[PDB]
Amino acid sequence: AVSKVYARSVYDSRGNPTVEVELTTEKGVFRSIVPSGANTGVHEALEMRDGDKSKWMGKGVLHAVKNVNDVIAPAFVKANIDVKDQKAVDDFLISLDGTANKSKLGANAILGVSLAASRAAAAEKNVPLYKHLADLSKSKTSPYVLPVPFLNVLNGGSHAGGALALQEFMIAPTGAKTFAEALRIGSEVYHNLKSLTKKRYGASAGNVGDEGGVAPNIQTAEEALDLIVDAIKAAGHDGKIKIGLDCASSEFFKDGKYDLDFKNPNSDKSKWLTGPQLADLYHSLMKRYPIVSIEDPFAEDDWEAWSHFFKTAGIQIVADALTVTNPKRIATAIEKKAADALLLKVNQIGTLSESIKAAQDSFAAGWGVMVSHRSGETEDTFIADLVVGLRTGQIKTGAPARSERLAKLNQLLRIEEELGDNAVFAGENFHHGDKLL
Amino acid sequence: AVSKVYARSVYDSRGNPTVEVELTTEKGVFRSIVPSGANTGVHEALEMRDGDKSKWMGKGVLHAVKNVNDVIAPAFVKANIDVKDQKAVDDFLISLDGTANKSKLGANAILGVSLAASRAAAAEKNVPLYKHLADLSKSKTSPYVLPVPFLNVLNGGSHAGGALALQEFMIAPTGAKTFAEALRIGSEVYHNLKSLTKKRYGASAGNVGDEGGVAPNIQTAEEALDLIVDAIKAAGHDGKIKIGLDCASSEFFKDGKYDLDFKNPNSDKSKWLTGPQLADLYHSLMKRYPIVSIEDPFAEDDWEAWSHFFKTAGIQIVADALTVTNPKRIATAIEKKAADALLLKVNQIGTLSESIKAAQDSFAAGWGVMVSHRSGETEDTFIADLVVGLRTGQIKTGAPARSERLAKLNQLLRIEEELGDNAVFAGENFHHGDKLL
Ligand SMILES: O=C(O)[C@@H](CO)OP(=O)(O)O
Ligand SMILES: O=C(O)[C@@H](CO)OP(=O)(O)O
Ligand SMILES: [Mg+2]
Ligand SMILES: [Mg+2]
């Protein structure tokens, strides 16, 4: 029985406040920390921020914490909900808030309780968290599947000072045989890349962005990709390490066209690309580099350009801004054959039950699911247990640097050790990890 | 009763392997993780690395992990040790190794067992870790004293491009009335600094170094200190925020003299500073900036230069590489009146008991103690409970960015909340926090 529900303010990996929730039962005190989200936006669940400019640059979460303590807590404890019934927990929270976008109580207030309940449930059942999540999601557990980590190495776009328009460059050690080996070789490529970066671009280019990757002043996608391929080969892992991109092409979508020089104030509007033109740019990259996944190749509402490219892409295409972990938008992407993988952000929908459903609906359609971090992460390792419980075969949780990233990666090491012969590393089968063996 | 001792490799905040230990008792499984420094003092207890070029850039810890699993563990479990008696735990570990510098087993094999035993002890006693640590150290608990956080905000020296030789610039919110307030106001200064740095040095100078501070190409100490003052002012916290330095002067110490242009390959050797001249440099900075602490002002065995400066410094002078958390070296520094505060790094000495002794010897000489992280940190939060247990009034655990730093700062928020009226914030009284009330 849940005897107490409590929230406090703590700090995320960017140094902004976030909500931490503790649920107390007979098994002890169970803690979940919510990562950074969005307090504005057209489709997604909205976190609640205080907007008091004299505290935390306006980014306080006192109101959301108060909603947990004053509103959610007494009604939840009184309801005497079975924490093992995650659907009942979440139905209760969703109905209490009464808004689609969770803006009455705040998506951050809601998710804290949702996730803490699942930890209390695992303890009641005397099972590890990932096992309980497997139960909730009805995933196959003979064997379990460990994910390929899509490790951030380098950033461009809004997160860098060069002309480079594309946002994320990731390495995926699909050629490793275990998760432990995957993380070792990925880390080796990372350090080789960092040293090469400092040598070529200067010491400051070695400083890290929010998610632990470098951000030198790179001019072109080819420059970035040659550097990565060269670091892969220098580390001795050519053939075992593949590449993933996040184009975040909504960031350079202007008046129906795509501006690959959007950071240039005097960008030649005649150089701007149409849908088919940008697709050919990706085709050219795919010919020259071991790219196995591309995220947000076209803008968040440009459905026809996604559907067109998907006809011939022939690699995993990941929806992020297109879908925003939103069920109706996922359904649309599936119908329009716009992509074949969902970037899954638990806090973007705001409950565990709805996150699980979004993954299941993707899997039903033959899609992949890449479990995702946020920019403001925490020491909480929930998404590590979640990626295993959902059997997805792939996770994006940062570079092998900054411990809000390493906490998840280390947790995956532990889970692999624990499961032993009843788990396999997804490796080359990352896309359909859920159907592996 | 300890039934099992186990170790595994995990990753620190820089993506390098380190040792994680788990100790099992009737109360459960207790986990401690060993941190790792860079350019470590010559006198630190040995951090054992594998040196296999073909794995982790030679930085593996397989040998240290093996020392736990194959050597310490079998013996420890058969030794019938009472984990509550930390002195007995550490006496046992030290007798196994039989070397002054823990070079037989590795300090990174010994420390994780030392720490995990204290967590297991706290659990047996049904007390939070900080209370157990207060008991072990014979510290007063009525009230406990919460630390001023010395927040890394800007880095120079080998950590940055540009000419700036001094390594570390910290802010200390001494004028706050609670820990929660100190962290809030410190975070606001940090964000103001990020914005200013990006505005003046470019977007990429907003990227962070290993401990979460910015590391732009800065030319002089005055330029850096002026930037920090501008950030404090813009945040509105003039008068409540003080400054600490860690010069890490051993890094620029060249045969009797100090090279303040050490990143210049053609640095002018006639311009290198003597001990007395460097002391004058510090005195000049002290007159123009609210500096209340300077760490490693002189090199790790340059005793005369420490002693001279200390005669007139008149502010807290902190020994890090000089003392390496070693009671033998502390006694020398006390005798030579070289400094008046210890930077306490548990992994410099290798056991909890020796670390506690080092703190106690320091307090007995009327020194302060600043409990410290390493530049390579993890999701482990031990030092937050330690700084409260030891009643020191000051901790150095990073910028308020990167969760290997926030994990400690968040834990301190939780401790403050738990203690309520049972604790006081050290504030202006940080130096002698142990003697407060
Ligand atoms: O863009 C994203 O996918 C996330 C993580 O990088 O960023 P934010 O959490 O700021 O939306
Ligand atoms: O010099 C120090 O005090 C520490 C932390 O700033 O660095 P390292 O852990 O590398 O010794
Ligand atoms: Mg994206
Ligand atoms: Mg130091």
Coordinates of N, CA and C in Angstrom, one line a residue, chain A residues 154-219:
Chain A
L154 N 29.7 13.8 -32.0 CA 29.9 15.1 -32.6 C 28.5 15.7 -33.0
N155 N 28.5 17.0 -32.8 CA 27.3 17.8 -33.1 C 27.5 19.0 -34.0
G156 N 26.5 19.2 -34.8 CA 26.5 20.4 -35.6 C 25.2 21.2 -35.4
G157 N 24.7 21.8 -36.5 CA 23.4 22.5 -36.4 C 23.4 23.6 -35.4
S158 N 22.3 23.7 -34.6 CA 22.1 24.7 -33.6 C 23.1 24.5 -32.4
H159 N 23.8 23.4 -32.4 CA 24.7 23.1 -31.2 C 26.2 23.4 -31.6
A160 N 26.5 24.0 -32.7 CA 27.8 24.2 -33.2 C 28.0 25.5 -34.0
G161 N 29.3 26.0 -34.0 CA 29.6 27.2 -34.7 C 30.1 27.1 -36.1
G162 N 30.1 26.0 -36.7 CA 30.5 25.8 -38.2 C 29.3 26.1 -39.1
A163 N 29.5 25.9 -40.4 CA 28.3 26.0 -41.3 C 27.5 24.7 -41.3
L164 N 28.0 23.6 -40.7 CA 27.3 22.3 -40.8 C 25.9 22.3 -40.2
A165 N 24.9 21.9 -41.1 CA 23.5 22.0 -40.8 C 23.0 20.9 -39.9
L166 N 23.6 19.7 -40.2 CA 23.1 18.5 -39.5 C 23.4 18.5 -38.0
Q167 N 22.6 17.9 -37.2 CA 22.6 18.1 -35.7 C 23.5 17.1 -35.0
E168 N 23.1 15.8 -35.1 CA 23.8 14.7 -34.3 C 24.5 13.7 -35.2
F169 N 25.7 13.4 -34.8 CA 26.5 12.3 -35.4 C 26.8 11.3 -34.3
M170 N 26.4 10.1 -34.6 CA 26.5 9.0 -33.6 C 27.2 7.8 -34.1
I171 N 27.9 7.1 -33.2 CA 28.4 5.7 -33.6 C 27.6 4.6 -32.9
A172 N 27.4 3.5 -33.7 CA 26.6 2.4 -33.2 C 27.5 1.2 -33.5
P173 N 28.1 0.6 -32.4 CA 28.9 -0.6 -32.5 C 28.1 -1.9 -32.7
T174 N 27.4 -2.0 -33.8 CA 26.6 -3.2 -34.2 C 27.4 -4.5 -34.3
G175 N 28.7 -4.3 -34.6 CA 29.5 -5.5 -34.8 C 30.1 -6.2 -33.6
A176 N 29.9 -5.6 -32.4 CA 30.3 -6.2 -31.2 C 29.4 -7.4 -30.8
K177 N 29.9 -8.3 -30.0 CA 29.2 -9.5 -29.6 C 28.4 -9.4 -28.3
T178 N 28.8 -8.5 -27.4 CA 28.2 -8.2 -26.1 C 28.0 -6.7 -26.0
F179 N 27.1 -6.3 -25.0 CA 27.0 -4.9 -24.7 C 28.3 -4.4 -24.1
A180 N 29.0 -5.1 -23.2 CA 30.2 -4.7 -22.7 C 31.3 -4.4 -23.7
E181 N 31.4 -5.3 -24.8 CA 32.3 -5.1 -25.9 C 31.9 -3.8 -26.7
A182 N 30.6 -3.7 -26.9 CA 30.1 -2.5 -27.7 C 30.5 -1.2 -27.0
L183 N 30.3 -1.1 -25.7 CA 30.7 0.1 -25.0 C 32.2 0.3 -24.9
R184 N 33.0 -0.7 -24.8 CA 34.4 -0.6 -24.8 C 34.9 0.0 -26.2
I185 N 34.6 -0.7 -27.3 CA 35.0 -0.2 -28.6 C 34.4 1.2 -29.0
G186 N 33.2 1.4 -28.6 CA 32.6 2.8 -28.8 C 33.4 3.8 -28.0
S187 N 33.7 3.5 -26.8 CA 34.5 4.5 -26.0 C 35.9 4.7 -26.6
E188 N 36.5 3.7 -27.2 CA 37.8 3.8 -27.8 C 37.7 4.8 -29.0
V189 N 36.6 4.6 -29.8 CA 36.4 5.5 -31.0 C 36.2 6.9 -30.5
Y190 N 35.4 7.0 -29.5 CA 35.1 8.4 -28.9 C 36.4 9.1 -28.4
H191 N 37.3 8.4 -27.7 CA 38.6 9.1 -27.3 C 39.5 9.4 -28.5
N192 N 39.6 8.5 -29.4 CA 40.3 8.7 -30.7 C 39.8 9.9 -31.4
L193 N 38.5 10.0 -31.5 CA 37.8 11.2 -32.2 C 38.1 12.5 -31.4
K194 N 38.1 12.4 -30.1 CA 38.3 13.6 -29.3 C 39.8 14.1 -29.4
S195 N 40.7 13.2 -29.4 CA 42.1 13.6 -29.5 C 42.4 14.2 -30.9
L196 N 41.8 13.6 -32.0 CA 41.9 14.1 -33.3 C 41.3 15.4 -33.5
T197 N 40.1 15.6 -32.8 CA 39.4 16.9 -32.8 C 40.3 18.0 -32.2
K198 N 40.9 17.8 -31.0 CA 41.7 18.8 -30.4 C 43.0 19.1 -31.3
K199 N 43.6 18.1 -31.8 CA 44.7 18.2 -32.7 C 44.4 19.2 -33.9
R200 N 43.3 18.9 -34.5 CA 42.9 19.6 -35.8 C 42.2 20.9 -35.6
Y201 N 41.4 21.0 -34.6 CA 40.5 22.2 -34.4 C 40.9 23.0 -33.2
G202 N 41.8 22.5 -32.4 CA 42.2 23.3 -31.2 C 41.7 22.7 -29.9
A203 N 42.3 23.0 -28.7 CA 42.0 22.5 -27.4 C 40.5 22.7 -27.1
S204 N 40.0 23.9 -27.3 CA 38.6 24.3 -26.9 C 37.5 23.4 -27.7
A205 N 37.9 22.9 -28.8 CA 37.0 22.0 -29.6 C 36.8 20.7 -28.9
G206 N 37.6 20.4 -27.9 CA 37.5 19.2 -27.1 C 36.5 19.3 -26.0
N207 N 36.0 20.5 -25.7 CA 35.0 20.8 -24.7 C 33.7 20.1 -25.2
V208 N 32.8 19.7 -24.3 CA 31.7 18.8 -24.6 C 30.3 19.6 -24.6
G209 N 29.4 19.2 -25.4 CA 28.0 19.8 -25.4 C 27.2 19.1 -24.4
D210 N 25.9 19.4 -24.4 CA 25.0 18.9 -23.4 C 25.0 17.4 -23.2
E211 N 25.1 16.7 -24.3 CA 25.0 15.2 -24.3 C 26.4 14.5 -24.4
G212 N 27.5 15.3 -24.2 CA 28.8 14.7 -24.1 C 29.7 14.6 -25.4
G213 N 29.1 15.0 -26.5 CA 29.9 15.0 -27.7 C 30.7 16.3 -27.9
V214 N 31.7 16.2 -28.9 CA 32.4 17.5 -29.2 C 31.6 18.3 -30.3
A215 N 31.9 19.6 -30.4 CA 31.3 20.4 -31.4 C 32.3 21.4 -32.0
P216 N 33.3 20.9 -32.8 CA 34.2 21.8 -33.5 C 33.5 22.6 -34.6
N217 N 34.1 23.6 -35.1 CA 33.5 24.4 -36.2 C 33.6 23.8 -37.6
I218 N 32.9 22.7 -37.8 CA 32.9 21.9 -39.0 C 32.0 22.6 -40.1
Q219 N 32.5 22.5 -41.3 CA 31.9 23.2 -42.4 C 30.8 22.3 -43.2

